[PDB]
Amino acid sequence: MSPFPLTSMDKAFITVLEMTPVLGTEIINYRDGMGRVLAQDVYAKDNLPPFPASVKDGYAVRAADGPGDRFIIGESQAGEQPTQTVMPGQVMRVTTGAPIPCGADAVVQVEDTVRILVQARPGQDIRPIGHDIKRGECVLAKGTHMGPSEIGLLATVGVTEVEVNKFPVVAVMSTGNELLNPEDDLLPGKIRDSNRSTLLATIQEHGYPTINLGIVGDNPDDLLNALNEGISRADVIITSGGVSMGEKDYLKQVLDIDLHAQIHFGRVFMKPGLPTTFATLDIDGVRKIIFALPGNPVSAVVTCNLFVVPALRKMQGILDPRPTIIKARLSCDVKLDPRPEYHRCILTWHHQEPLPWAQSTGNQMSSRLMSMRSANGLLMLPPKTEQYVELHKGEVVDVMVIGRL
């Protein structure tokens, strides 16, 4: 027990989501579309294909003209729509994707040919006008999270500037008088500032804009002055600065009093990251969000992936920001804790076995196990039960995904 009530793991999560806004929209060029959500429906401007296109390449033919040897009056090549008009007794050369010439009924295959090896059937391998997409049909629904394939669409249709929810710019700082820039030669009594690097990287991996607020000391003055630049510059401020005992308030005091922010929770029943701190602040309608994560560089990653990310997603108007949780077999025996544990691990789907194996990377410090694969997901161990004390190799556990799996 501290000045703050211990918040349920689930309650903490559901709070961060519920409290988080959704940003406004923006018009962006479809090329910048990648990983965004559509704040508009998108409708076809014209048919596609806009002309009957040839599935095969050979000869565009009249069905009522049937078999036999016929005289050709020209070519149709992919690029241009034909001038020449097919009349009873003629024929035209084609290409796969070349427009069918005004007068033709169907087309001819390869070893089926002007010599003609025939057994006629109308509509023979022609892509009918508007067969893929019809003028005015909706092609991308409002709220769609755009992949490359979607940009493809956006291009196809010819919609080049779309309304999309804006990405949230995220400002990140680190508190502590004991930190130096990883460049700077290690002076006495100082450690290097590890988290800011990891966090800025962790969120950029998702492709949100970052604002590096640097190292700020463990003192209310410079502390607030940062938080200020934060709110002024960005939509989310993240703080990585071990605030657990004796001076846990230092930061919380500043939000609570100077900033007039509302701490939604200050401690959470989880391992690691007990001292995690959410918060909101409304300055002229705009609701800013503030995570204050612990200092333990492992915690800092774990919590960030459990709270910040889900919140950042919700913020860009992702519909279901809940993180993908897959089932996986444990790779080593684990001692369960009174509180719910989260362990970075590496998911591996072995060459046929239906479930993937998950092996932890470490508990504390740096890393227990060394690998060339990077932390795939993080492992969701449950609280220890009156019945359950430890999980054994092979047992099937929850793993939240945290990177290109």
């Binding site: 719910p340 161990l381 449950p382 039960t385 999980l391 099937v396």
Partner: peptide
Amino acid sequence: NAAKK
């Protein structure tokens, strides 16, 4: 195994 998530 017990869930939790």
